[PDB]
């Protein structure tokens, strides 16, 4: 069998074996395939696909390459969360108390940021003395202890693909619906959880720009979830502007705190109590998604939600005073405003833009080995949809330099009014099951 | 500039600057751009392709990361030819010594194998001792002193076609028009010679599947030579099927030599008469096509293109007595015959599967540094029309290995047999001036 043979058969179109991409994987990960035909065959699986079958056959090779956790010491049904990738997607930061706080077991892994897109990790560093390097042992023991734990996605899962996204990165081949469905997939079956809830979104901020990329996207990954036992199931959410107002981190911490409270903005509390029913479904801790949502409402009015974020804190190094003390989170020097040009209606606000935006004021990092400055980011005040007054301010910039015309720059490039009344986005889109 | 916003661009279906396309080449050569980067691009070229301007570019930057040779101390006309690559193509070994036992100056640059298609410059290096890779100060004084010379590249001439060739041919990324326009062209450019004959094959056996893409490529290099003050012109020859019997190395040298004493097959003599007149006539060295030809025909039964061979041989380094004993020509030590499952007539033929399963003996390489094996490869006996009864045999195998199941079923799916008589296929399609 020639490597070359089998770039050939997917340049032309062709489906390529389980035994013929199994045979691939183990050669790159070994090293018997160089980087230069896995790149070439990459960028022709860009151009041409994959078949869900194929998609699945490249999962599983992926799992195989490493380890597989063990989590049969925790007693019960294990939940997991994953989202494609976002700006200002706070919603773990919110979700994994409040089904925790409710007897839902979250053993959660995650990643940081990069580009115009956040990663929890550096959101959850803003706390003081947050660790986010914890081991299989002391992973077993927080979930087991408090009913939760979100940590650093620990090396030693899946090689294939540490080696393969960082190929993707450096070839232009990040945006590839098999190369994604695999990738996120093959981390979640090696983590263990019994059950997998997806957040796929769509629009200017994700990958998926189009709804029917986005469909086909949480569709394979569900089937591959299935397919070796789990009970996986997927929501397609909005994108095209970002989640809530706030976009950064010590500023994304500070709106989760407000939502667990019960004053957080409507689409990230909807978002959350969404796909917390069917965290507490699938862990069977309620009858039905109904009974479930109950629940996790009453663990919000009652205060639970909010204990349970402070125990979650203290679990792992974080300073959970600065629940009820915000200004012990990083602080920005300075704040300055984007105002509306004239009356109107908002018609966009370019989630990627806004992304970018923050990334310049230090709030991101263009390549993995930058610091992030943990203050600094952007805040909303409106959102598609809503009218604005000519001098009205639409963004409230928070730095740590007063020197920021381009970041209020790309800003402007982002937002886009109407004379006429706009049509709202949907939050979700669709659920698959 | 960085390597991975270009990657990006031509993948996203736009044109790269003349700047850009010149950044790229200039980095690739000289080691600061990674080949699996460069095979990334390569491949985008293949599904998004080139401009007409790109194209130009692409051949002048590759032209110009070596030097330019100048043949004026020669006296005449010098030619040059070049295949777009086929099946079976001994076509350079009789023409090249043929035409130049005439008076014909010949400056040739040649490659090695690539992809499905053989290299005259792997098939020179079957003959013991003979050098293909001389200095520009030798090539100039051997096609003075002897009036013919086939080298290889990266003797300080095309040094970025050296490694983008090599690179290409394990790649899959060698049928695109623009790579392969501008890999032929760049040679014939930094080569120096005055006229420029072309052979683009169609068929299943070439890169170029239908006449209409075949008809594209003639075009695309005739206006490329034109443009830069050389009589180019180009000859559309058939490769639905491989030309002559052998294909290989050293057994394509024997047919070389078979062919040039009068005894070869009919289509390749043919072949080698048509290309070889209008190199004689480009050169002024005979009044008309018809007259070259007959002044051709007339070197082959005086022994003078077969004396030519010789000298063309020792000049290099090479052995001039393998003529006379062909036993002194690397041998495989199996040999194994593929027959026909029943009675009929040869109706088509998988030329380029045919090209493969010859790769696959060890005809050809599977990555960059492999070392390949001279002797293997294999012998046609039936061709398009010929009738055949079950039992008889259509090929014969020489392999360095006694299984060689996978390449016997190749071979026998590639020849399709049909029960009604099926005519031969033309030799010659069009010309292009
Ligand atoms: O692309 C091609 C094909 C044949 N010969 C070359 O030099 N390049
Ligand atoms: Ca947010
Ligand atoms: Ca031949």
Not at 103 to 118: D, E, F, I, N
Not at 338 to 347: E, H, I, L, Q, R
Not at 363 to 379: M, P, S
Not at 399 to 409: A, F
């Amino acid at each position: 069998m020639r490597m070359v043979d089998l770039i050939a058969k997917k340049r032309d179109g062709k489906a390529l074996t389980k035994e013929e991409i199994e045979w691939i994987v183990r050669g790159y990960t070994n090293g018997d395939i160089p980087d230069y035909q896995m790149s070439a065959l990459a960028m022709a699986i860009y151009f041409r696909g994959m078949t869900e079958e194929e998609t699945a056959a490249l999962t599983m090779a992926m799992v195989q390459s490493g380890e597989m956790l063990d989590l049969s010491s925790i007693r019960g049904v294990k939940v997991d969360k994953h989202s494609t990738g976002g700006v200002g997607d706070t919603t773990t930061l919110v979700l994994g108390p409040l089904v925790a706080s409710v007897g839902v077991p979250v053993a959660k892994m995650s990643g940081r940021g990069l580009g115009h897109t956040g990663g929890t990790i550096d959101k959850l560093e803003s706390v003081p003395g947050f660790h986010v390097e914890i081991s299989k042992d002391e992973f077993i023991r927080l979930v087991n202890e408090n009913g939760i734990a979100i940590i650093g996605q620990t090396g030693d899962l899946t090689p294939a693909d540490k080696k393969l996204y960082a190929l993707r990165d450096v070839t232009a081949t990040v945006n590839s619906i098999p190369l994604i469905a695999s990738s996120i997939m093959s981390k979640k079956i090696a983590a263990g959880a019994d059950a997998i809830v997806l957040d796929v979104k769509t629009g200017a901020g994700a990958f998926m720009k189009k709804l029917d990329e986005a469909r086909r996207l949480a569709r394979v990954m569900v089937d591959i979830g299935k397919r070796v036992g789990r009970r996986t199931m997927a929501v397609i959410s909005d994108m095209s502007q970002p989640l809530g107002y706030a976009v950064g981190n010590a500023l994304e911490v500070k709106e989760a705190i407000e939502t667990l409270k019960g004053n957080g903005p409507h689409d990230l509390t909807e978002l959350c109590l969404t796909l917390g029913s069917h965290m507490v479904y699938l862990a069977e801790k309620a009858p039905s998604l109904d009974e479930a949502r109950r629940l996790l409402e009453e663990a919000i009015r009652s205060g639970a939600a909010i204990a349970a974020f402070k125990t979650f804190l203290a679990a792992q190094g974080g300073d959970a005073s600065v629940v009820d003390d915000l200004d012990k989170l990083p602080k920005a020097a300075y704040t300055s405003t984007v105002t509306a040009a004239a009356d109107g209606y908002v018609a966009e606000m370019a989630a990627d833009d806004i992304g970018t935006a923050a990334m310049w004021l230090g709030a991101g990092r263009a390549k993995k080995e930058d610091v992030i400055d943990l203050a600094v980011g952007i805040v909303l005040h409106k959102k598609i949809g809503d009218r604005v007054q000519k001098g009205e301010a639409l963004a409230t910039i928070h730095s740590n330099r007063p020197d920021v015309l381009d970041v209020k720059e790309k800003i402007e490039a982002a937002i886009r009014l109407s004379p006429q009344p706009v049509a709202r986005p949907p939050l979700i889109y669709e659920t698959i099951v």
